[PDB]
Amino acid sequence: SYVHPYGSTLPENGVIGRGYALISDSGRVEFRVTDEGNIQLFLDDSRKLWSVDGKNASFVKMQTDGNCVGYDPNGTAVWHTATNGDDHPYNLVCQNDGNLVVYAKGGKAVWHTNTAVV
Amino acid sequence: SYVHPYGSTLPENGVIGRGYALISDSGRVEFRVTDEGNIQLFLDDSRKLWSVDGKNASFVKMQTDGNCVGYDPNGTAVWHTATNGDDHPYNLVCQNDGNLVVYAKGGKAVWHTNTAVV
Numbered sequence A, B: 001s002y003v004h005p006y007g008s009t010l011p012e013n014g015v016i017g018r019g020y021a022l023i024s025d026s027g028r029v030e031f032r033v034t035d036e037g038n039i040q041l042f043l044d045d046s047r048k049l050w051s052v053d054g055k056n057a058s059f060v061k062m063q064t065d066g067n068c069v070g071y072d073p074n075g076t077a078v079w080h081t082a083t084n085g086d087d088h089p090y091n092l093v094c095q096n097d098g099n100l101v102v103y104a105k106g107g108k109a110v111w112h113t114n115t116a117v118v
């Protein structure tokens, strides 16, 4: 199982490493970085809503530049939301509806998984 | 070896989990959370300057309340700097001199390991 250091939300400077995850308030939706180096959004520990698999991800960081980035152990980017901007604060939120969202200031969604299935 | 998602410094909302670490600019001083659940500050991968061992630590978080806290996988605190305050921003810095320091605003040291050995 995955440890949850952040509840639902990865704020600026937040980092999820292998074995850690965001978890929805409901408990049903989990955004994991796996020991197998995959970045995966799961419903009910059963349904893979969204993933970046096969790239040896070490961690995901919600950066102070607004970009949300997955890195391998060597610091090479393996995934990014391309959300760079100045509309601070930025947050990555794992929602009860299943959607994983990068919000800019004022609750402005600037990237999402498009997986609001609940 | 330990992945370094933060260089030397754990800012507010920063989290180090098992297998991750802060690293000094010099490369010589590393603040690790181990797979064995220990929180350890090492010089030259050889000399344990400071540690909290035996408590099954899962992660260390530099919190937005100013407190720097080590937690087990169940969210129980196993270590804290007791640095809670309003002098934002707070940062935990792993320095080239060997010292691990919680700084409040303006570079005010409010907690340290007292391990400035280099």
Ligand SMILES: OC[C@H]1O[C@@H](O)[C@@H](O)[C@@H](O)[C@@H]1O
Residues within 6 Å of the ligand: A063, A065, A067, A069, A077, A079, A080, A084
């Ligand atoms: O796409 C990867 C890179 O994108 C850049 O704009 C920055 O956000 C970097 O921090 C990141 O590593």
Ligand SMILES: OC[C@H]1O[C@@H](O)[C@@H](O)[C@@H](O)[C@@H]1O
Residues within 6 Å of the ligand: B063, B065, B067, B069, B077, B079, B080, B084
């Ligand atoms: O000592 C443990 C606890 O201390 C409190 O003041 C807070 O900082 C908590 O977040 C923390 O878990």
Ligand SMILES: OC[C@H]1O[C@H](O)[C@@H](O)[C@@H](O)[C@@H]1O
Residues within 6 Å of the ligand: A095, A097, A099, A101, A109, A112, A116
């Ligand atoms: O487009 C993003 C938007 O999609 C849905 O409407 C919901 O998941 C919202 O919470 C989210 O902000």
Ligand SMILES: OC[C@H]1O[C@H](O)[C@@H](O)[C@@H](O)[C@@H]1O
Residues within 6 Å of the ligand: B095, B097, B099, B101, B109, B112, B116
């Ligand atoms: O007391 C904390 C203080 O100790 C030493 O003087 C150095 O390591 C400083 O960088 C640090 O701020």
